[PDB]
Amino acid sequence: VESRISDKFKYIIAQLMRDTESLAKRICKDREFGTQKYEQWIVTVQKACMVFQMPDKDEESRICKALFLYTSHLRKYNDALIISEHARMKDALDYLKDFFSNVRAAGFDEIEQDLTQRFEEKLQELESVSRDPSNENPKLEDLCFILQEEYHLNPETITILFVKTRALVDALKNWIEGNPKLSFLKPGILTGRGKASGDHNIL
Amino acid sequence: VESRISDKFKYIIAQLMRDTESLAKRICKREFGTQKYEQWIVTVQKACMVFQMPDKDEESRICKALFLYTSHLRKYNDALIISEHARMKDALDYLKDFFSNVRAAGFDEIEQDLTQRFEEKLQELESVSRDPSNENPKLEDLCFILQEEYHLNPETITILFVKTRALVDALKNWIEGNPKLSFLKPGILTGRILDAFKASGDHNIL
RNA sequence: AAUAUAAUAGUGAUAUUAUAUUC
RNA sequence: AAUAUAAUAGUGAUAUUAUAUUC
Ligand SMILES: *O[C@H]1[C@@H](O)[C@H](n2cnc3c(=O)[nH]c(N)nc32)O[C@@H]1COP(=O)(O)OP(=O)(O)OP(=O)(O)O
Ligand SMILES: *O[C@H]1[C@@H](O)[C@H](n2cnc3c(=O)[nH]c(N)nc32)O[C@@H]1COP(=O)(O)OP(=O)(O)OP(=O)(O)O
Ligand SMILES: [Mg+2]
């Protein structure tokens, strides 16, 4: 199949990656978005920020915490880009929302509050952009076609759906029951433990 | 002995107290450095725990807020009492200890601002603390008694009873930090030592 | 803590991440 | 968790804080 033709989501979130790496661009004294290359880069950067040293140790702690947080948010945004490449944009948005929910649960950090604030500024525009039926990815459409045809021919069909990541497991889990056309499907989840006659039609 | 002269420290701390009180009085509708104020601020703190709103998260933030404000108010009060029974440096060290422990636990939006408001009066407070004219007459008289009694008898085992642990640490630091009391080697006895407190031991006063 | 697989970077020993398993 | 003492409001049972102790 074909990749989705236009990213509004990535267009605006590349601005949050840019603004976050601009914030990082304030404190630093010193590649494509949505790829594994950027993940490797941001991980190596995160490991590079830990070894930076100053005579004042507390200031050092402040800016190191800052850099760690910035690179972390960057990583999560990247993850969102990928997730929405392989799934709905609602799933990526909800990934980020889960992320910031956890962050809010952690405690109030000046940096975290800032970043979450700048994210919340773009939230309306974002949810505006994934509620539209126009933006549904070609891959999920084709998958929907396959499932529809196969279950039309054989309603008793048992399916098993393999995906690379657990995030995508949750993503398609929600995508199936969030899809009116797929209503004949009774999804189920199979993953690992770590950090026909029944009614589950698809696993 | 008479109570202290004029307290600039108490004036500053009082202003901070009524400012914090203004922060707390924004939401809801007897002097400073007294036990009465302590009972009052306790009952008030308990009254803020009954505060209820249809919105539970905003309620959470508000009750947390009032808890923080009442807490800092309490600590201010205690600091005033300590300054009354001891050096001003002891009170400022008490407050510094408190705010340090507050910093270590992580900063809420509000605690950061309270710490910020304390920080600006910190320089003036210390400026008052380093002022010799402001010294406590109680400690004057105590120092006098110790001086006389140890002058007449160079070997004297003293035991000094005080009300609170804060005064124990305060008077320990006061004895260790007084040039006139240099003949003293203080020691501490509190609740949850004695063999070194003898006449042949390392401790003259306990 | 160890192990396997996959993608990515590197000529490669490797490295990062993802996934799974074991002790 | 219980017990004692002190200060404090209440006429008082009590209550708050402080101090100390015990299981
Ligand atoms: O260095 C490791 C290791 O010493 C110890 N550890 C944790 N789980 C195991 C295990 O299954 N087998 C062995 N031999 N050793 C183990 O913990 C250290 C690291 O702690 P982690 O934070 O990685 O462990 P945690 O439980 O938080 O994560 P995970 O085990 O689920 O992946
Ligand atoms: O309700 C109390 C009680 O059940 C239990 N507890 C704590 N200390 C004791 C004790 O010495 N003897 C008995 N019988 N029971 C005890 O803990 C509950 C309350 O916990 P706390 O936070 O008050 O106890 P903590 O250790 O944190 O403080 P402290 O009393 O030792 O100073
Ligand atoms: Mg005292």
* SS3 category, B103: helix
Question: From the CA atom positions of chain A, what is the Rg in Å?
Answer: 20
φ, ψ (nearest 5 deg) of residue A112: -60, -45
Q: What is the 3-state secondary structure (H, E, C) of B38-97?
A: HHHHHHHHHHCCCCCCCCHHHHHHHHHHHHHHHHHHHHHHHHHHHHHHCCHHHHHHHHHH
φ, ψ (nearest 5 deg) of residue A43: -70, -50
Task: Detail the DSSP E strand segments found in chain A.
Answer: none
- Could you give the CA distance from residue B168 to residue B81 in angstroms, rounded to a whole number? 14
- B164 backbone φψ class: left, alpha, beta (φ>0; ψ -120 to 50): beta
Q: Is the dihedral of CA A89, A92, A98, A104 positive or negative?
A: negative
In the block, tokens 């004219």 appear at B133
Q: Which of B73, B52, B60 is nearest to B109 (CA)?
A: B60
Exposed/middle/buried for B115, CB within 10 Å: 0-12, 13-18, 19+? middle
Exposed/middle/buried for A154, CB within 10 Å: 0-12, 13-18, 19+? exposed
Question: From the CA atom positions of chain B, what is the Rg in Å?
Answer: 20
HSE-up of residue A113 (Cα within 13 Å, Cβ side):
7
| DSSP code at position B105 | T
Ligand 1 within 6 A of CB of A193: no
Helix axes of A57-86 and A89-106: crossing angle, nearest 10 degrees: 160
Report CA(A39)–C1'(C20) in Å, whole number. Answer: 21
- Could you give the CA distance from residue A92 to residue B153 in angstroms, rounded to a whole number? 82
Contact (CB, 8 A) for A157 and A150? yes
Q: Which of B105, B174, B99, B109 is nearest to B136 (CA)?
A: B174
Residues at the strand D interface (Cβ < 7 Å): B 35-36, 38-39, 42, 163-166, 190-192
Report CA(A12)–C1'(D1) in Å, whole number. Answer: 59
Gapped junctions in chain A, after residues (C–N > 2.5 Å): 30, 195
Distances, alpha carbon A168 to alpha carbons A82, A87, A161, in Å: 10, 7, 11
* SS3 category, A166: helix
Contact (CB, 8 A) for B128 and B9? yes
Q: State the CATH number of the domain containing residue B29.
A: 1.20.1320.30
Contact (CB, 8 A) for A172 and A182? no
Shortest distance between the Cα of A22 and any Cα of chain B, in A, equals 25
Q: Which of A104, A102, A100, A76 is nearest to A167 (CA)?
A: A76
Q: Is the dihedral of CA B93, B95, B99, B104 positive or negative?
A: positive
- A29 backbone φψ class: left, alpha, beta (φ>0; ψ -120 to 50): left
HSE-up of residue A79 (Cα within 13 Å, Cβ side):
20
Q: Which of A43, A41, A33 is nearest to A78 (CA)?
A: A33
In the block, tokens 């933030």 appear at B61
Enclosing domain of residue B11: 6-135
Residues at the strand C interface (Cβ < 7 Å): A 36-37, 39-40, 43, 164-167, 191-194
| DSSP code at position A173 | H
Shortest distance between the Cα of A121 and any Cα of chain B, in A, equals 20
Ligand 1 within 6 A of CB of A29: no
Written as one letter, the residue type at B165 is R
First to last CA, chain B: 23
Residue at minimum CA to C1' distance from nucleotide C16: A40
Which ligand is located closest to the Cα atom of residue A193? Answer: 1
Q: What does the DSSP assignment read for A111-150?
A: HHHHHHHHHHHSHHHHHHHHS-GGG--HHHHHHHHHHHHH
Strand partners, A202: A159, A187
Contact (CB, 8 A) for A23 and A116? no
70-129 in B: which are within 8 Å (CB) of A? Answer: 106-109
Q: What does the DSSP assignment read for B146-173?
A: HHHHHHH-SS--B----SSHHHHHHHHH
φ, ψ (nearest 5 deg) of residue B7: -110, 110
- Could you give the CA distance from residue B33 to residue B145 in angstroms, rounded to a whole number? 27
Longest Cα–Cα distance in chain B:
72
Structure tokens at A140: 């999920």
Q: What is the 3-state secondary structure (H, E, C) of A26-40?
A: HHCCCCCCCCHHHHH
First to last CA, chain A: 23
Contact (CB, 8 A) for A81 and A36? no
Q: Which residues contact A28 (CB under 8 A, 6 or more apart)?
A: A67
- Could you give the CA distance from residue B195 to residue B206 in angstroms, rounded to a whole number? 12
Contact (CB, 8 A) for A202 and A160? yes
- Could you give the CA distance from residue A84 to residue A73 in angstroms, rounded to a whole number? 17
For a ligand 1 pocket test, name from A191, A193, A195 the mutation site with the most ligand atoms within 8 angstroms of its C-beta: A195
Alpha-carbon dihedral A55, A61, A64, A65, rounded to 10 degrees: -170
Q: Which of A95, A106, A103, A97 is nearest to A166 (CA)?
A: A95
Q: What spacing in Å lies between the alpha carbon of A195 and ligand 1's midpoint? A: 10
- Could you give the CA distance from residue A154 to residue B22 in angstroms, rounded to a whole number? 72
φ, ψ (nearest 5 deg) of residue A178: -90, 5
A108–chain B Cβ distance below 8 A for any pair: yes
Q: Which residues contact A171 (CB under 8 A, 6 or more apart)?
A: A83, A86, A87, A88, A91
| DSSP code at position A159 | B
φ, ψ (nearest 5 deg) of residue B164: -120, 160
